[PDB]
């Protein structure tokens, strides 16, 4: 039950596709949602940008039950083929009961500053009697792609986890016409050591 009635994130997926040759296709998921405990949002204010339109400014600007914290264990165990063209992309699907203009902003934040902001505009599509906004194979920034490569060459995962300490992503979906916050998803990462695959905990953000 992630998201409000205004807009509900049902699917999230960051992936690497590889085409070694015309007969060979490979897809690797780094993280995936869609295939609750609460956290005091003030504890994670020292990890996200709290300036104009910051995780703090938005908290009071819109509904508090639209704010979520996700801890990802990313799956980095993927053999990056050196002879194959590779698409690094992000597919996210949001389902709503109302038709509104939807703008999704994905910001990669290092320390307290967001290095890269990507703004995607989506429109309601009527499927199975509801309005669905879906971003299809959206390309990740060169920053994210380089970041994954730089992580890979680290010798140990505890080193990977250490650099991820100061890495966060803030995902804010907003009604463009009303500027109302529809969904806000604050993202924190370790590297999954699980053989089975990537894991993820979702927490509702609260204040006290």
């Amino acid at each position: 039950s992630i998201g409000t009635t205004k807009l509900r994130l049902v699917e999230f997926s960051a992936f690497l596709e590889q085409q070694r040759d015309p007969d060979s296709y490979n897809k690797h998921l780094f993280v995936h949602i869609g295939h609750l405990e609460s956290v005091d949002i003030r504890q994670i204010y020292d990890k996200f940008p709290e300036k104009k339109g910051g995780l703090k400014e938005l908290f009071g600007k819109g509904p508090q039950n639209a704010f979520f914290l996700v801890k990802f264990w990313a799956d980095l165990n993927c053999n990056i083929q050196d002879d194959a063209g590779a698409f690094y992309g992000v597919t996210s699907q949001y389902e709503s009961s109302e038709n509104m203009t939807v703008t999704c902003s994905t910001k990669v934040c290092s320390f307290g500053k967001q290095v890269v902001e990507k703004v995607e505009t989506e429109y309601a599509r009527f499927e199975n009697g509801r309005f669905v906004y879906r971003i299809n194979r959206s390309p990740m920034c060169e920053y994210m792609i380089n970041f994954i490569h730089k992580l890979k060459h680290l010798p140990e995962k505890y080193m990977m986890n250490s650099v991820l300490e100061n890495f966060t992503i803030l995902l804010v979906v907003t009604n463009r016409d009303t500027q109302e916050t529809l969904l806000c998803m604050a993202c924190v990462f370790e590297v999954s050591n699980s053989e089975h695959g990537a894991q993820h905990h979702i927490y509702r953000l609260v204040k006290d």
């Binding site: 320390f111 500053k113 290095v115 703004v119 995607e120 920034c141 894991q199 927490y203």
Partner: protein
């Protein structure tokens, strides 16, 4: 669907900054913060599910 990406000028430098904060903390000159392990966070935050 329009994907406009906003990049600040020192992205790749910062990317290195993210790393050599760990790989040589002294020659880093990076903001400092409380590690997540030491924050008031649920126990789950560091034990992945099964």
């Amino acid at each position: 669907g329009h994907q406009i990406v906003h990049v600040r000028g020192d992205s790749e430098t910062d990317l290195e900054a993210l790393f050599n904060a760990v790989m040589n903390p002294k020659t880093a000159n990076v903001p400092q913060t409380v590690p997540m392990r030491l924050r008031k966070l649920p126990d789950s935050f560091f034990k992945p599910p099964e």
